[PDB]
Symmetry: D2
């Protein structure tokens, strides 16, 4: 087939004390409603199981570890996979991944793709870690991802998810044309991921009123230039006193926004997706093999 | 500190019978108007000295050649350079370049940067030739760029132009993130060029109503993701029965559009440009050294 | 209730020879798919039963009359109402209305609202007739609505349609703030209608590339300023050699576009609608009774 | 024929302790810069002579009064008028007006138009006072306009300013279609004003990320639907712990944005304005005499 209905499950805030059981309840509800609307795949936010902990400066490692998943899924998250298989609707779930190798802990900002059978068919680990590295007393909230996470070691892969070639990005990655391009070259038909974007940036507050503009601009250009459908799921609202951006969206391979959220709570949007639409770009104006000149792009790949 | 007034000189149509002498009078008029408005640099369109000849299939090589420049500047175009030096305003001029080397008549879609002293500071030759190589019957008007030009051989250079790092793109180039990124990586503070974009696309007519959108989307995303000011000068209006896109523009490093033409005739727009404003992006969210992961972009440079 | 799922059924072209039976087939299909996606109301285009005949200069009245409905519904259109009642989904259908009063024929560009029970609960007749009045030989297609239709005599009413207060506009009306305002004052929660908008305007072709911009601008401002959800259903594509605008849409009371079509064929888009969202505007920034100053708006109502 | 260069002088913050003498130096600087760029008229912000005092509840009437002008111009503001006449550039200046009539201390949020001769050509008093009348505890900062001003008593006039029909609006007014329409009906070719728009809205915080969108949406739709050029000068930046919206702009009669500020500081933008361009709308799609149906708008003018 080449037809499907894609959905985005935007999340409202997640409190520090809110349990994964409670979140799964909210997650289940969205997946159920999306399915009731015909969707066979739903995109969830970056780190969708917990509050955005990278905003705090940690000192107690046990504290930090508590925000990561040591298995996927665990007993508490399993019900999501079961419901996924039951209703026949895949999903993109973001979470904090903790792996212990030879006694050494490895941390990643992760996202996985589950097909409509309820099976994990791909994973991606955040490659572009935003923010600063050291505590900055002036900021009303920190952004210490470079500390609590290592740069993804999977590159930007593209997986087959129920007849659709899908690629993954996580939050900040969406702002990097390289991320989109690599997956575009790998033939992605859909490029999705979630995000936690504060509408306020302490180091550059003069860009606060452009938060939506910059986010939407990234999704539209990315889709357009790679002739791919895209979807972004944000966790929005006032979370732990930090206002997070909404405007979760689904974009056509022409860069046109076909669905957009308007609340700052859990919200489901859907859009019919024709995987062959990609050809309007990828076989003409952006027919890579016929127009690209990689012999002159070398600087982009230099270390 | 490090400020200037950038101008864009959009051209209205140029008829097949319109002479270069006549076109130069028009270019002189806009350059002068720009200077009277405080502009230190003005961006002119792609192939700004003649009608867009790539729309017709030529059988007479003598006739095809007439549309190319063998000198830059020649006696006819020279007056433009003199005015530039006189009024202290540089410019970016696009034209068809014909040069014989090693027994080969090389044809380039070229653009040059002249500083406010009237001196040619640097050149660029279109690398992404859009369209087709052979006459196509299903088209109401041709776009034989692949036939009339060979891909530029200068890469995507960035030159110093009156203490401003400027990079050049030509029409279709603006749609490629690779072009923008290479120059962004070279430190371009201003990225500019001209264009001839028919509002009708024979191959994919269902995108006709998106001509403007796709054009501005490319300029905005390019500027933003590279923290560079940008400007695009189009040649618009009904030229030889083919409508060309207007919306010539100047964009800030934030991707915000600061100036936009509203007519389809010769028109000058201007904007105050602060070269330090690039830092808001290039020293933060898009601080390449601190964020880019080139080890993962290799596929982009693969042949 | 205050929750519902609104849908728009965009139509591809309708040939002059295409029969109403064939159109109903297309109409039925969209209403069925919209219902399968949870929608309880679907908006259809202006004059959705026929080709846009106002583009031709008629001479044979029998010819002209053939494009109008003498009853609503007739045997051929009835199946739409039946399916509507069956699936529990109302709709907004536009059509050419022919009424014979005392031997005198009355013509209107009409639209009706059918609730989920399949009953007509309101009607509106186009008040702002666009175009010219006399044949203009230069135009590749005419726009003679002022001739084939009389100005609506129902004003801009607002009806109760299954727990939702809905108002109607037809094509061009959407460009007039007065139309939106009157219905906004009447408490409309949803303001919908369809349209036939050629992407080319013979008298002002310099606005062709702005066709989408102007259309979307009208829907967004209208919704925002009246704190109402809105939806526009277009009949798009190359119809009888005239390219018609797509970008059918659904807008939130904040002016945000929550759903947008991307093809130029029959296409269904949906969006969840919370009738209470209207309060965010109508009870605050646009709390009419608390902020408006009608004693100074007199000029708007003067004849 | 009938052309001019319109400028907008956006203000950065104005501290409570900042004196009028100091503010005037800033206004003189932008007016001069505008003239050097060929501008014949510059639009300044709402209450451009002091900080936005409506944000604080005052108990001392003497202190509240200090923020109002009793003369226009007074010795301190006079220098601005002299420069205007000298450089031949008119302006639109907003300030708090205090006038005693019939034993009443009348307080208006005012704006005046001065021609390029330094002569006050006309006045306007804000008719739509946003905010509230009594101190509200739930607000982080007040907006007591309803308390500190009474609705203007001059209606929405249109004056001749150096052969240009200009109408005035003040901040919140721009959001009301009635204000735009009244002046549109009066034949305004340019509709302009200033504003103080906090990017945070206590009553409806879920619209904070839409502050820019709503602002530009209002300017664009107003211009387009009335076929009028427009311009809005905002006072932006972090003023007294409250962030104010930037994005000061100039819009063509088509609703297209031709110039837009990018900083949150004092900034001058300009645009070439062709007063005849209004005809493209006012003599066609929006030819009022030929299209408006006032007999159906009565509710708009009802008290």
């Amino acid at each position: 087939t080449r037809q499907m209905i894609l959905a985005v499950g935007q999340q409202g805030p997640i409190a520090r004390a809110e349990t994964r059981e409670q979140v799964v309840v909210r997650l289940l509800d969205m997946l159920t409603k999306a399915a009731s609307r015909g969707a066979n795949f739903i995109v969830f936010p970056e780190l969708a199981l917990t509050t955005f902990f990278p905003r705090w400066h940690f000192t107690d490692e046990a504290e930090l570890d508590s925000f990561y998943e040591t298995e996927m899924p665990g007993p508490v998250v399993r019900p999501l996979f079961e419901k996924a298989a039951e209703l026949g609707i895949g999903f993109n779930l973001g979470y904090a991944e903790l792996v212990v190798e030879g006694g050494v802990k490895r941390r990643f900002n992760t996202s996985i793709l589950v097909d409509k059978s309820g099976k994990i068919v791909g994973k991606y680990r955040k490659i572009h870690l935003p923010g600063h590295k050291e505590y900055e007393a002036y900021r009303p909230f920190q952004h210490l991802e470079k500390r609590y996470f290592e740069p993804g070691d999977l590159g930007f892969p593209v997986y087959d998810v129920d007849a659709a070639k899908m690629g993954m990005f996580i939050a900040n990655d969406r702002r990097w044309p390289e991320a989109w391009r690599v997956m575009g070259l790998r033939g992605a038909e859909i490029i999705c991921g979630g995000y936690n974007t504060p509408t306020h940036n302490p180091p550059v507050p003069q860009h606060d009123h452009l938060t939506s503009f910059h986010h939407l601009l990234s999704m539209q250009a990315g889709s357009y230039q790679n002739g791919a459908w895209s979807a972004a799921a944000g966790k929005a609202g006032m979370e732990e006193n930090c206002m997070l951006l909404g405007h979760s969206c689904i974009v056509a391979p022409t860069g046109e926004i076909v669905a957009l959220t308007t609340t700052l709570e859990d919200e489901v949007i859907t859009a019919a997706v024709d995987l062959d639409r990609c050809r309007e770009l990828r076989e003409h104006i952006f027919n890579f093999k016929q127009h690209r000149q990689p012999q002159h792009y070398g600087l982009i790949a230099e270390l």
